Write an enzyme that holds these catalytic residues in place. Structure first.
Site, PDB file in Angstrom:
ATOM      1  N   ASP A 146       7.287  35.448  55.509  1.00 43.77           N
ATOM      2  CA  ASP A 146       7.723  36.269  54.307  1.00 43.77           C
ATOM      3  C   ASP A 146       6.968  37.591  54.507  1.00 43.77           C
ATOM      4  OD1 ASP A 146       8.266  37.860  52.032  1.00 43.77           O
ATOM      5  OD2 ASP A 146       7.274  36.276  50.568  1.00 43.77           O
ATOM      6  N   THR A 188      11.943  41.773  49.473  1.00 48.19           N
ATOM      7  CA  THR A 188      10.694  42.105  49.761  1.00 48.19           C
ATOM      8  C   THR A 188      10.570  42.678  51.366  1.00 48.19           C
ATOM      9  OG1 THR A 188      10.088  39.874  50.627  1.00 48.19           O
ATOM     10  CG2 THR A 188       9.818  40.135  48.391  1.00 48.19           C
ATOM     11  N   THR A 189      11.303  42.063  52.322  1.00 46.17           N
ATOM     12  CA  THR A 189      11.175  42.363  53.544  1.00 46.17           C
ATOM     13  C   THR A 189      11.700  43.520  53.806  1.00 46.17           C
ATOM     14  OG1 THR A 189      10.585  40.282  54.292  1.00 46.17           O
ATOM     15  CG2 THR A 189      11.136  41.609  56.062  1.00 46.17           C
ATOM     16  N   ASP A 207      11.408  33.378  44.234  1.00 44.69           N
ATOM     17  CA  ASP A 207      12.003  34.483  44.760  1.00 44.69           C
ATOM     18  C   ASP A 207      13.732  34.312  44.243  1.00 44.69           C
ATOM     19  OD1 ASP A 207      10.087  35.901  45.658  1.00 44.69           O
ATOM     20  OD2 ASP A 207      10.319  35.514  47.632  1.00 44.69           O
TER      21      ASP A 207
END
Lengths: 517, 508, 513, 73
Positions: free
Chosen positions: A49, A82-83, A380
């Site tokens: 992550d 997020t990434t 998530d």
């Protein structure tokens, strides 16, 4: 110090993002690779992550601090997302620097991205703007939690987790409020459980159990004593503990603590509450007196958690023993110490159904990672599912939309005489690294990969099919079911492009060095 | 934070596990060259080690990659047996395997799945090469034996390994599917007997009872106690502290003599000549208890009570005060015997059965230690022998068959992953190489041929690296549970595959 | 890797390099050493044998050496240097093999193949002599003794060792009379002539004072009870703020103990072995003063060593509190004897003690400790050689020449083995010839002549004959007045066969962290 | 393996001496001399024996290790 400007800090800007983004783009998505990351504490943390990589890193530059914090918004907002918001944010710097190297003033290129970020989020809007309710979304939610749960490479049988995330978010974050609410979700779980063992317990489950098995293991509906009263050492903010040094000092210590708790356990039972949950719970001495008066009741509870049994249970609050009355009590649907099949995870449920003001997901796993695995998996999932529960808006992801977004803008670029077409180009040109980097994590030619979809996006004129996000050979975002909240798809853009912009308006840097976090 | 990048971390993931995967495989295979554990880092000493963890664990692991294997191969060892040697090497082998691929940059997506599939290929090939010798119980006894034979083999034990050839099989049989130290209670003690170990009746404990207590008791009704005395029993009056001046310093040690005597009284309410507890006393209290008539038998074996309670029908419990909360038990005789130069009190009258006691006599603790561990691995693998009676021929025959069946699968099934899938098979054939030199024998002419040889169907035939020869793994009894072998295939793939998926290591 | 290759060679480096200058072996050869240590010193050193035990050498292959040396002592009592003199012998042959490239584990069992047949060729050259026979016992010990520091007292020392054994020995053939059985007890004063051979258990402990019991009917045992008194084992309520409170307990303290020591002597105790444990006191200083008034032999906090012999020889058991009287589990002793000779030394002699048929206690006396220790070390090799006869029946040579006698042979045995090991064992099979020259080696100039010809001499003496290393000249070494029991030398192979082979195992290096 | 080869016939030499066998110079599975048909005029080997023994002697020739300054110069 030194004011470091021009290419000086422009490097210090473009420098930090690349080291950051790449471990994230090598960890990007399920094909993203699982990175062991060990502290100065000597502790292995395997991170696929980017946010966890972001949580693991702090890279020295002010933006690398903020990029860790950047995803956290969309990680709080959207969960997933997020990434990608970071990895591409550095690609703009690649784009932008060359563009400044093209001689285009930094604020020029700075603006065109956001200027073109419209169609970015705007082209997304056209895919699925849809909205569904809980029982409808639960199929798209599990279908999205095919991807989101599987984003941690744990979705298998975990439609259990998806379906408990379906009814968790709507409870806390209402579809009508359209306000982010995870607060009344009570995050709960224990190491030693299973991925396949996971529960949504609509009430509150307290760690402590019945003071004796001889006393009944069932407290009836409602009639719970919510109190701050000592049945063990009180532990206030500050007091020093002095013990007894004498034989004649030892005997009376046992009598008094017997004499008050009886009356207190009496008065509590006399108050009419068959579970005494005391903000200061029971010593082992209060347990037998609790058995003397024969009342089921709970030992030490966290300070605010006695409120958590006041809010979640709908029971009207009694703060302390001194005020005991039968009117205001704690509520429970059913009080049971529950083992899930792993006794390593053992909770006493204070059960809420009629009035549940804190919904509790209970997550399980064999190890600290495995819970956290399932935790960040479902959490998530939970947020995308929350996004979809409010408005169920998806897109066919993994760059299939990035290409289709890259069409309009890069096209729309030249439509404009304006300088920002180059930005708009480089804007739409910066989009496609995700399937590229994905195909790299997917272990394929990244370069044709993008264009395979544009060959599609020529044909398609829409993301539906895509390349392989799962490395399973079916080239789909559709039947592969790469399906994610179109909200968070738009959240990466606005966060990435507008943060970089704010990074870009600052080439003005006063630091002792170049990049200071 | 401090982020190891794609270049270093994986080559670090390469070297570290490979650097720890070197030493135990010298020890490994038939006539494996022993590793000498050198302790200059704690004391300054030499240690002779075939043992993976003793090699591995006695060296603290620093490198993040050296962590996982030494961690994964460790639990693989406590679980499936002798996993510290296999999974370390096997994963380090696959790490040796990945490098050319990584030098070629075979995608980290590709290698994991490639080795994922080929892992099944060998696991299936191992399964294909796995056949039950446990079809008949006596065959299953031998199957347990032949599988224990591969488990018990190549250790410093001598009469122990042979004692546990039957003892595991005897325990694993009468447990019907399990293996345990509850069916056989290990007592590792000193004695003139070097590797000699036998199955005890009742149980024995190491201590001598002097003073006024007779060293032997007849008609002994065991009163079992998890509770005992520290020579001082905390209670209301036991908290007396008079110390202020140096005179009270002189008076305080003497009050202990006042404390020791009242403790005898709580046992007399029970009215039994034989009271066993899990706690110990000095001689001066030994002077008190035999005078009052209730004999204090101190520090009873936790397994010893369990030894009796399983056979004698007694119950195991906790928090003893009065005889009711912990069920009584019966030894025919409570006696003290002369074992070598060791003087031991001994309980008996119940012989073998469900629960047994295994007395391990040794010159050192070294010869004692392997015996419980070699049995530990035997019992579990022989418990595995119940689940799969499949015994596939060890000593490389299982190994050289798998890579074969992997190969053809590693060929057409991938259009790419032959990079991985074949590199997988290569590691399977590496273990026969690191033994062949240890046998002094040629790996090459052996392996590719002898694999194909027995992969063309001589399954009993295989690698005898005692003699270095191509040899029969049946008559040599070199064969082992398909389970223990499948499981060490399971972990090492990951320990290699996990840190492959690690391209970056951040240091916070 | 190179590390496994080099570290073995590096282990082969250090250990071999030490074992060479470790051979001046015996002789009056080579110049005396002070030693300035690794961390520094000036250590005046002599006699590599003790030097071997003194030897601190610290290196992975160096530590096995000090071990290797010490073992042949406890294995034999002799050959302490001899196990190392053939150690570097093994350490060479490995190289040429690893230089030939031969696999070390293939080299490993070659050591067995060398040790397997080597002891038999030693057994072949072994001249078997009776292990219970006074003469063989005398004569074999005499060769050690005549070579020991007292060759005079040896005449009195050998029959002691002969009788120490023959008492302790199991009748007729026996592997028996350990150095654990034998309890060598120094006594200050007396004479080496007054070194006394006692069949029974003499505990070397110093008896309290004198004029105590020398009489019969002892009771000796380790007693873990303590003598109570006020401010001893017994409770008091009185803190001392004053001088009288200090004195009152004492007046009751010494009197009550004085009546406890009676119970001890009332038990029949002419000795007690006091537990090393105390509370405030255990047996107080006045208590012992009171026990000795009753002629109870006492040594406060007795050495743990005599504690074991009395439990080993007599079978002593714990004893009940003196206020409980006793269990009479004091070991059986009919004599509490304190001998004083040269007016020096206090020696408990328990005779009539329960004894297995073993445990001789040789009482070693002399005008000085140095006088004491001469025979004491001498009678030890009188004991050990005989013990080596007892443990194994033979008289071979001493000095290491019969190693060459094994060497000519074991060469051909390899040549017959016709294996790769036939090259492995043979490379050592001759390499064992090195010692007789390396004994001689470390002294002078104009070196060469004797060295090569020694192995040649015996080689020309062939299998049956050879040069005597000590006495010189070619005569069969096995019976010379240079002799050993074969047990001495065979263990030297065994010990070295393995610790050296243990180096062949080492791959790379670790350090436990 | 050169060792185990020499070892091999070393066993065979213990078995039989001056064998019609030998090693395999042709690297045949059979290690022979007769059926390798490897052989030399006993002139030759002896003559071949002479030479190295001759030369390893010739290195010993007399004494002189001195040169004018020129030995290989």
């Amino acid at each position: 110090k030194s004011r470091l400007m021009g290419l000086e800090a422009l490097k210090s800007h473009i420098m930090a993002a690349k080291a950051v983004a790449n471990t994230m783009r090598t960890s990007l998505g399920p094909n993203g690779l699982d990175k062991m990351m060990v502290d100065k504490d000597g502790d292995v943390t395997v991170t696929n992550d980017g946010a966890t990589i972001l949580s693991m890193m702090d890279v020295d530059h002010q933006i690398a601090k903020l990029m860790v914090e950047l995803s956290k918004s969309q990680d709080d907002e959207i969960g997933d997302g997020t990434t990608g918001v970071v990895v591409l944010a550095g690609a703009l710097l690649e784009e932008a620097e060359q563009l400044l190297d093209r001689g285009i003033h930094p604020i020029r290129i700075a603006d065109g991205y956001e200027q073109a970020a419209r169609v970015a989020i705007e082209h997304l809007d056209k895919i699925s703007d849809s909205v569904l309710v809980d029982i409808k979304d639960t199929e798209p939610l599990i279908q999205t939690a095919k991807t989101t749960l599987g984003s941690k490479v744990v979705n298998s049988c975990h439609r259990q987790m998806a379906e408990i995330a379906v009814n968790a978010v709507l409870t806390v974050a209402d579809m009508e409020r359209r306000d982010v609410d995870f607060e009344l979700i009570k995050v709960e779980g224990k190491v030693g459980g299973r991925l396949e063992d996971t529960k949504l317990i609509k009430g509150v489950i307290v760690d402590k159990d019945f003071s004796h098995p001889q006393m009944p293991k069932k407290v009836e509906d409602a009639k719970i004593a919510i109190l701050t009263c000592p049945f063990e050492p009180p532990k206030p903010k500050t007091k020093h503990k002095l013990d007894v040094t004498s034989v004649e000092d030892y005997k009376a210590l046992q009598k008094y603590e017997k004499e008050k708790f009886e009356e207190m356990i009496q008065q509590i039972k006399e108050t009419g509450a068959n579970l005494a949950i005391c903000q200061w719970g029971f010593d082992d001495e209060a347990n037998h007196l609790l058995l003397q008066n024969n009342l089921p009741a709970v030992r030490w509870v966290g300070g605010p958690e006695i409120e958590l049994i006041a809010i979640a249970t709908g029971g009207r609050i009694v703060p302390r023993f001194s005020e005991l009355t039968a009117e205001k009590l704690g509520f429970a649907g059913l009080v049971q110490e529950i083992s899930f099949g792993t006794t390593k995870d053992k909770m006493l449920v204070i059960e809420q159904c009629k009035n549940s003001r804190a919904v509790t997901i209970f997550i399980r796993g064999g190890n600290k990672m495995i819970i956290e695995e399932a935790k960040r998996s479902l959490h998530d999932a939970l947020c995308v599912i929350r996004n979809l529960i409010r408005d169920n808006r998806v897109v066919y992801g993994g760059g299939a939309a990035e290409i289709s977004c890259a069409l309009a803008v890069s096209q729309e670029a030249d439509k404009c005489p304006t300088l920002e077409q180059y930005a708009m180009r480089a804007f739409a040109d910066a989009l496609e690294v995700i399937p590229m980097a994905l195909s790299e994590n997917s272990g394929m030619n990244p370069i044709q990969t993008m264009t395979e979809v544009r060959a599609r996006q020529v044909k398609e004129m829409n993301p539906a099919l895509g390349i392989d996000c799962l490395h399973k050979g079916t080239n789909d975002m559709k039947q592969q079911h790469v399906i994610e909240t179109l909200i968070g798809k738009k959240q990466q853009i606005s966060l990435a492009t507008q943060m970089v912009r704010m990074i870009l308006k600052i080439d003005d840097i006063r630091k002792p060095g170049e990049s200071e976090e | 934070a401090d982020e190891e990048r794609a270049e270093t971390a994986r080559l670090t993931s390469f070297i570290g596990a490979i650097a720890i995967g070197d030493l135990v495989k010298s020890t490994l295979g038939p006539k494996g060259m022993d590793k000498i554990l050198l302790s200059s880092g704690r004391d300054a000493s030499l240690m002779v080690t075939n043992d993976g963890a003793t090699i591995l664990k006695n060296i603290g692991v620093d490198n993040p990659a050296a962590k996982v294997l030494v961690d994964m191969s460790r639990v693989q060892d406590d679980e499936v047996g002798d996993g510290t040697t296999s999974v370390t090497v096997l994963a380090a082998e696959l790490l040796r395997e990945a490098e050319s691929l990584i030098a070629k940059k075979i995608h980290p997506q590709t290698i994991i799945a490639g080795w994922r599939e080929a892992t099944k290929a060998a696991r299936e090939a191992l399964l294909s090469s796995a056949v039950d010798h446990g079809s008949d119980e006596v065959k299953f006894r031998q199957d347990l034996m032949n599988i224990a034979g591969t488990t018990l083999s190549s250790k410093l034990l001598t009469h122990h390994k042979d004692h546990f050839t039957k003892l595991a099989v005897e325990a694993v049989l009468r447990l019907k599917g399990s293996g345990n130290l509850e069916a056989i209670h290990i007592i590792k003690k000193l004695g003139g007997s070097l590797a000699d170990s036998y199955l005890d009746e009742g149980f024995l404990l190491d201590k001598k009872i002097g003073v006024n207590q007779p060293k032997r008791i007849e008609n002994a009704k065991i009163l079992i106690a998890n509770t005992g005395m520290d020579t001082d029993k905390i209670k209301i009056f036991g908290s007396r502290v008079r110390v202020d001046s140096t005179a009270k310093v002189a008076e305080i040690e003497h009050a202990e003599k006042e404390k020791m005597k009242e403790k005898v009284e709580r046992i007399l309410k029970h009215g039994i000549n034989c009271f066993i507890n899990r706690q110990l006393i000095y001689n001066y209290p030994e002077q008190l208890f035999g005078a009052a008539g209730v004999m204090a038998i101190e520090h009873a074996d936790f397994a010893g009570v369990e030894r009796l309670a399983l056979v004698t029908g007694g119950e195991i419990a906790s928090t003893f005060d009065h005889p009711e909360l912990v069920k009584l038990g019966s030894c025919k005789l409570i006696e003290e015997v002369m074992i070598g130069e060791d003087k031991l009190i001994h309980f008996s009258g119940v012989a073998l059965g469900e629960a047994c006691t295994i007395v391990l006599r040794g010159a050192t603790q070294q010869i004692l230690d392997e015996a419980e561990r070699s049995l530990h691995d035997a019992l579990c693998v022989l418990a595995q022998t119940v689940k799969d009676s499949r015994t596939v021929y060890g000593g490389g025959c299982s190994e050289m068959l798998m890579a074969h069946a992997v190969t053809q699968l590693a060929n057409r099934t991938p259009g790419k992953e032959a990079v991985a899938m074949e590199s997988y098979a290569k590691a399977l054939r590496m273990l026969p190489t690191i033994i062949a030199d240890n046998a002094g024998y040629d790996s090459a002419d052996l392996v590719a041929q002898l694999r194909a040889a027995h992969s063309e169907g001589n399954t009993t035939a295989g690698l005898d690296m005692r003699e270095g020869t191509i040899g029969d793994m049946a008559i040599l009894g070199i064969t082992e549970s398909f389970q223990v072998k499948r499981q060490v295939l399971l972990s090492a793939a990951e320990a290699a595959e996990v840190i492959l998926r690690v391209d970056n290591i951040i240091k916070a | 890797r190179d590390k496994p290759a080099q570290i073995r060679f590096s282990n082969i480096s250090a250990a071999k390099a030490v074992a060479d200058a470790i051979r001046t072996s015996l002789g009056p050869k080579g110049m005396d050493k002070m030693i300035q240590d690794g961390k520094g010193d000036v250590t005046i050193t002599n006699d590599g044998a003790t030097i071997l035990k003194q030897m601190q050498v610290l290196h992975p292959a160096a530590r096995m050496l000090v071990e290797l040396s010490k073992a042949q002592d406890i294995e034999a009592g002799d050959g302490t240097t001899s196990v190392v003199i053939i150690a570097g012998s093994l350490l060479d042959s490995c190289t040429k093999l690893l230089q030939k490239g031969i696999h070390p584990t293939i080299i490993s069992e070659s050591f067995q193949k060398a040790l397997e047949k080597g002891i038999e060729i030693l057994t072949d050259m072994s001249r078997p002599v009776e292990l219970s026979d006074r003469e063989t016992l005398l004569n074999s010990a005499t060769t050690s003794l005549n070579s020991k520091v007292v060759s005079q007292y040896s005449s009195l020392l050998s029959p002691m060792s002969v009788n120490a054994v023959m008492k302790v020995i199991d009748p007729a053939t026996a592997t028996s009379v350990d150095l654990r059985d034998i309890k060598i007890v120094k006594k200050l004063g007396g004479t080496i002539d007054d070194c006394e051979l006692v069949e029974g258990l003499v505990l070397t402990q110093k008896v309290s004072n004198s004029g105590i019991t020398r009489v019969e009917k002892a009771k000796i045992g380790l007693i873990q009870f303590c003598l109570s008194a006020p401010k001893t084992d017994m409770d008091n309520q009185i803190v001392v703020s004053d001088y009288a409170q200090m004195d009152r307990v004492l007046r009751e303290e010494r009197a009550y103990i004085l009546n406890l020591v009676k119970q001890i002597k009332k038990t029949g105790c002419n000795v007690l072995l006091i537990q090393k444990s105390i509370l405030r006191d255990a047996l107080s200083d006045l208590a012992l003063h009171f026990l000795n008034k009753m002629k109870i032999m006492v040594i406060k906090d007795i050495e743990r060593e005599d504690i074991e012999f009395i439990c080993k020889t007599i079978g002593t058991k714990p004893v009940a509190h003196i206020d409980q009287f006793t269990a009479d589990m004091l070991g059986s002793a009919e004599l509490a004897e304190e001998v004083n000779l040269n007016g020096s030394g206090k020696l408990l002699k328990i005779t009539g003690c329960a004894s297995p048929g073993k445990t001789v206690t040789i009482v070693v006396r002399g005008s000085n400790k140095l006088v004491i220790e001469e025979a004491e070390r001498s009678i030890h090799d009188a004991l050990c050689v005989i013990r080596c006869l007892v443990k194994k029946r033979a008289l071979i040579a001493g000095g290491g020449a019969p190693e060459i006698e094994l060497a000519l042979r074991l060469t051909e045995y390899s040549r017959t083995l016709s294996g790769m090991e036939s090259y492995c064992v043979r490379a050592f099979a001759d390499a064992m010839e090195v010692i007789p020259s390396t004994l001689a080696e470390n002294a002078g100039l104009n070196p060469i002549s004797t060295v090569t010809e020694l192995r040649n001499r015996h080689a020309q003496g062939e299998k049956t004959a050879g040069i005597n290393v000590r006495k010189g000249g070619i005569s069969n070494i096995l019976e010379e007045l240079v002799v050993q029991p074969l047990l001495v030398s065979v263990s030297a192979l065994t010990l070295a066969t393995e610790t050296v082979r243990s180096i062949l195992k080492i791959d790379d290096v670790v350090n436990t962290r």
